[PDB]
Paper text:
The genomes of Bacteroidales contain genes encoding glycan-degrading apparatuses that typically co-localize in discrete clusters known as polysaccharide utilization loci (PULs). B. thetaiotaomicron contains almost 300 different GHs belonging to 60 different GH families, and secretes at least six mannosyl-glycoprotein endo-β-N-acetylglucosaminidases (ENGases, endoglycosidase hereafter) that hydrolyze the chitobiose core of asparagine-linked, or N-linked, glycans (EC 3.2.1.96). Here, we discover an ENGase from the GH18 family in B. thetaiotaomicron, BT1285, encoded in a distinct PUL with its own repertoire of proteins for catabolism of the same HM N-glycan substrate as that of BT3987. Altogether, our data suggest that human gut microbes employ evolutionary strategies to express distinct ENGases in order to optimally metabolize the same N-glycan substrate in the gastroinstestinal tract.
Author numbering: 42 to 150, 163 to 507
Amino acid sequence: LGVLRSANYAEDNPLLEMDHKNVSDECMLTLTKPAEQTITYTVGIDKTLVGAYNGKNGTNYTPFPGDVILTNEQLKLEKGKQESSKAHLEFTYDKNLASAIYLLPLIVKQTIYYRINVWDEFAPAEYTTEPLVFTHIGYIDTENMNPLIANKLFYKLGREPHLSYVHAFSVINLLTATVKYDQSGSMPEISYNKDISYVLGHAKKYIMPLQAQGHKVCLTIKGDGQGIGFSNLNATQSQKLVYDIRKCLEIYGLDGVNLYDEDFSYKKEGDNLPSAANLCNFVTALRQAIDDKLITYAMTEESASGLDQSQNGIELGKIVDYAWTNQFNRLVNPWREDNPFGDDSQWKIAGLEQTKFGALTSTLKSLSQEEGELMEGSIFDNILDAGYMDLANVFVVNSIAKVVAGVETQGATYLLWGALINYDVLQGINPELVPGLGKGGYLDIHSDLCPKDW
């Protein structure tokens, strides 16, 4: 008696994601008792087991009809060991394969039941039009990343026969344009680096495809450190930047703008100081100009004080679609007194419903043991124990970045916290980021999922 396991997957019957390329896995035999003598078993394909599997598990899988190349099919079990040598399975992709989930049973002659998801041209098999239950906002740094990677990241929701695939993000923020003085040194203008220019100049290639798959796409605007920005514009300057932002979203088919309140290098003394009232007047003007296009606000330690109070009757929270902070890998709760994780009252925005606040903005950085405990504690205790459920509606990822050495642990989890709370805990639906594991997945440090091509 023994078990035919996968070498890289703990799932008894692993589900591989085949996006128009081959997929592979290795399996081995684990014997309940150590081998008395050196024996060799052989693994083979038996597609006759499919009908019994679909009856037992309620599924509808058709046996995988593509070419399957098994190498090292003879499993060597040395005396005294319980695990054999590893066989290798290469599932060949071909255009003659329709998009579906297939089954390929591998037997000893127990049994392992490989499931192969053959993707369509836009989404995996069993993709659904069912919308994500929460708003997931993803930054893409156009200096290193292709915005189209959003169209490759999915959530595998549920367990068979109730599997569903949904896009992992619903809003995408493009990093970044900046605000600086104009050539005459009197007016603010938007400045675009070489990367964000090519993205916007080719919005038909990089933006409309995202919008076609349900993504709202916004342009982020930071400062360029010349001391002029969203919170210190006079009447004339405000009308200029409002006009230019309104024009920019119309010109490139953008759904909205993300006001990233950082890097303006505001002076601490002089005649153009930052004020929360100026910010409220500028954003109020922006809202009149762009109508229902999205305005979001990213708060930082460089934000002006007073946003917890109305400014000339204006509450910034009433006129913005979403807000969040740069307090990465930590759940910020500005409405919680005696907060055991730290007082976040500085991040309070007057008029902002909790359901519009990204309490958790995660970033791709390795965390210490303490930092890791702070992240999970702040998330769980605030949303479940303290009862701030409304803080589970918006989740933000500041830069979907490449998974590399030293950030594999955060890479695997920092895009799943919103699905973890909303689906796995608040409902019973298991969530998995796809395409994660395996050669070529988002978590393969030697592969780029959807690389920069300009």
